[PDB]
Amino acid sequence: MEVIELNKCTSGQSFEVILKPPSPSLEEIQKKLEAAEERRKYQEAELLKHLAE
């Protein structure tokens, strides 16, 4: 087991132990946002269409 990188400080210490070694831009955003608001304004306008019937 090997320690390393041990730093000290009035607040505390830190160190590391090793047990062993290894072996969408703002436009494309606004676009898909708009595609969703259109699908709403449609489904709604279609609700208002069927009501008007």
Partner: peptide, 15 residues
């Protein structure tokens, strides 16, 4: 995992 070392990074804060 083998492609990573089997170690522990430690921090101590006295407060």
């Amino acid at each position: 995992v083998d492609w990573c070392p089997t170690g522990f990074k430690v921090g101590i804060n006295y407060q």
